[PDB]
Amino acid sequence: REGVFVSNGTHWFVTQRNFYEPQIITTDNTFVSGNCDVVIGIVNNTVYDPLQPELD
Amino acid sequence: LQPELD
Amino acid sequence: ALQIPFPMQMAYRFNGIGVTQNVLYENQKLIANQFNSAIGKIQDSLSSTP
């Protein structure tokens, strides 16, 4: 949504552009658009969903 | 989400 | 000066004009061709203009 996907060698994070503040990649700070074969340079990682931890 | 308790 | 991949820079500028960046990553090829063609016509325009 805002920032850039930055990886620090082993883990991927999202961070605002003008000041380093890494956050866990979750469904709240990202939006989806289409299948993942047209974009160039896409990588793989787990995208956590906050609804699962509640487990009602 | 708490009041709904789905 | 902080180095940044050029497509990501153009994605930022797209946000700047109110168009979401997914629009850019899905039309990279076409956009690049359009940009190259325009740059090519610039020189011809300068040369033909009296």
Find, in chain B, the residue whose alpha carbon is nearest to that of A51: B1
Region at C39 (left for phi over 0; alpha for psi -120 to 50; beta for the rest): alpha
Tokens of A29: 């700070």
Chain B CB contacts of A54 under 8 Å are 1
For residues A42 and A35, give the distance between their C-alpha atoms in angstroms, rounded to a whole number: 11
Compute chain C's Rg from CA coordinates: 14
C25 and A CB contact within 8 Å: yes
Q: Strand, helix or coil at A14?
A: strand
How far is A1 from A33, CA to CA, in rounded Å? 12
d(CA A22, CA C25): 23
Q: Answer whether A32 touches C (CB < 8 Å).
A: no
Chains C and A touch (3+ CB pairs under 8 A): yes
Token couple for A2: 């805002």
Calculate the dihedral angle through the C-alpha atoms of A35, A39, A41, A44, rounding to the nearest 10 degrees: -10
The resolution, in Å, is 3.8
Nearest-angstrom CA–CA distance, C40 and C34: 10
**Which helix (H) or strand (E) segment is A6 a member of?**
strand A4-7
